[PDB]
Design a protein around this ligand. Sequence first.
Ligand code: FA9
Ligand code: ZN
Ligand code: ZN
Ligand code: ZN
Lengths: 740, 12
Amino acid sequence: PLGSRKCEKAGCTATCPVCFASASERCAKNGYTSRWYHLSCGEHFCNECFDHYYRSHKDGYDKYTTWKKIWTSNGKTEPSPKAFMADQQLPYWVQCTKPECRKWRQLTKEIQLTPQIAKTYRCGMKPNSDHCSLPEDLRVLEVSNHWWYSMLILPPLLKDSVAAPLLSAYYPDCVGMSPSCTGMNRYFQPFYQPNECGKALCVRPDVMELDELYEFPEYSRDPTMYLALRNLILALWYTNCKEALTPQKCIPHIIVRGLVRIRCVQEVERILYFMTRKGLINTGVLSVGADQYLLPKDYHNKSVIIIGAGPAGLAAARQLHNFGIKVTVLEAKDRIGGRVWDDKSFKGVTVGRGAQIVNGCINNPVALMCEQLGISMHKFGERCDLIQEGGRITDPTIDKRMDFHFNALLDVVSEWRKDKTQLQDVPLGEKIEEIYKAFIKESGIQFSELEGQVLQFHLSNLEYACGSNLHQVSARSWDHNEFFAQFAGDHTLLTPGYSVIIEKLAEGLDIQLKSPVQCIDYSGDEVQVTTTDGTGYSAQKVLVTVPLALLQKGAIQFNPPLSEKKMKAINSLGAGIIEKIALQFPYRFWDSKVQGADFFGHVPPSASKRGLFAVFYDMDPQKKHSVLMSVIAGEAVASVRTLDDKQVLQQCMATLRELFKEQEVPDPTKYFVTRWSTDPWIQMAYSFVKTGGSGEAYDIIAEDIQGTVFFAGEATNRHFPQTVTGAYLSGVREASKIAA
Amino acid sequence: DPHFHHFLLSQT
Ligand SMILES: Cc1cc2c(cc1C)N1C(=O)C[C@H](c3ccccc3)[C@]13C(=O)NC(=O)N[C@@H]3N2C[C@H](O)[C@H](O)[C@H](O)COP(=O)(O)OP(=O)(O)OC[C@H]1O[C@@H](n2cnc3c(N)ncnc32)[C@H](O)[C@@H]1O
Ligand SMILES: [Zn+2]
Ligand SMILES: [Zn+2]
Ligand SMILES: [Zn+2]
């Protein structure tokens, strides 16, 4: 009775402490010791094994002292002996993989657990019978106790985390990894680097997000363990995005000593299901059979009707279906896609009638889906000569000077805006002109006719981006979204076209074409949905993803009706528009002058001609086929409404022959002219903020009604308005709301 | 600062 059989730790449940270390030849083993040291309720080490490492005279001091330097040389947390024991000496635990057994087992203290060992382990396995029948150590079931983790002194620290290589710039212990530790698509950069400017869909390796905190409050005090698991999961997903990430797949990559490993394994499942629901992993164009739904059966019971089969509806439909939720999509047109619609009949090339460009591929779901599909994008070159009528290529210094001046007018507007309210908003177009004449009259500087036309060109570039003449767009709010982190990296041409992704998202889903929804009634126990021919559908929840213009036209009857607040938000945004023309030629007539540039600009002769074929795109990055695509923006959209396709073509060809005046231009052998503005179920290209409006409108439209009626679409995404990406993400957003 | 915050983990 010289020594103790009781644990130092007050409240500890261990009635019979035994020493896991047996490092000292004088180890107390399971008998009496001066003091029992507590790592967990199930794990202790005696005073002499403590001293074996902690005392300068003992034979373990060497090792401990070295570890302590490293722990300090690429680590930040305190290197006590308890920390050393949890990181270096604590025996590993591994779960038997026999389906009928599944018992946890302690490995002998010299065996170093690896993924391979964890993957295939079953009771009794040693490098050099009836092992599964032996009872499971009692301390294992203990780990499930609510207080077990509170009785655990130091948080776990993962070893050889898949996330480690992507996290070199951090101290491993701040991201749940062990300091004592020693080709991914370039577009996958899920982790912020230390002190780096904001970018879209990026997370801090060392801080829990709002939603994470909300779902896992028990970690607000200490996130170490959560962060490590979440980081490991993200790294695994992006390491192989072509298959579903499962707990079985994650478990072998969780390497840490002691019973706590059991806690980590049991936690990785909850975290993984949270990441899946929010759409962080197991997403994109990944598809899974009935046998393999991504969420447990408890999310499964409920039904959804999704209205619209564009990127937004299809994203949500894909997500929900993958979750195991019963989904039905109703599409008005005779095709899926919405504002994604590819013409695949041009020999050797795919020409988008709608979207075909990706602005910022880093962390972009579109770039992820390309990886999953094994398709390539073409990054745009920089050069874009501004060609005049007829023939002269504008001096680049004139291009850069007027660009500089145009952005200048924008800066001053961003100053004038700082003290105005929505009630005081003025059209961007008006305020620009005004600032221009002001500046002109101040410093008498005058611009050449060509300078004024090049400015006309740059102005047209903003009208294109807004989908409207600037006299309808808000000076206060035109660029509201820039407030949020935007997608970094390459701007590309989706050569194969967005349709490839649309089709994958749609494959195997219950989709009803030519079924235009007319009535939505959510006043009863289930949502009653009625099409224009009187066909009835019903489900517990309904997701609306129709274009902004269709909400403004009130094409769908809501009962109860949308709120006045919602109607104001809906009416405060503009239904922006542009159209495209695509021309096929017998040969690449522009090669001599264009010299391999992806696109070239067309200087407007006069303000009146602004936006009329402002830019031409060479639609084959391989420089082999001959297809040009051009855009009609701003006022020019109007002037084309009353013309038939043949007439639009005439003016394009005439424009081209002016642009290439000093040479012959062959006749086109195939073309299309888009009519988005008069497509009855679309009537637009993309949204923008009208004068008097706020970026807040996007949130307000996005707001669900009574957790019964939900909304998605490009016009509901405040961070990323307008884009296929933003539309897709809004659909993922709603799928997460709905699945909860 | 929501000039950093992940769009998908900021919905509450
Ligand atoms: C039309 C068009 C679009 C673009 C482009 C050109 C053109 C001509 N792009 C460009 O050239 C560059 C360009 C760009 C981006 C930002 C700002 C300015 C330009 C874009 C591009 O290339 N890249 C891109 O991201 N999208 C752009 N892009 C915009 C995107 O295509 C759209 O934002 C995206 O497709 C929106 O998806 P969402 O899912 O929100 O709507 P969509 O309209 O596709 O589908 C809704 C569906 O509801 C259906 N529907 C409507 N009413 C009903 C009803 N009552 N019942 C049932 N179904 C209905 C309707 O038929 C339709 O299928
Ligand atoms: Zn001991
Ligand atoms: Zn204890
Ligand atoms: Zn077993």
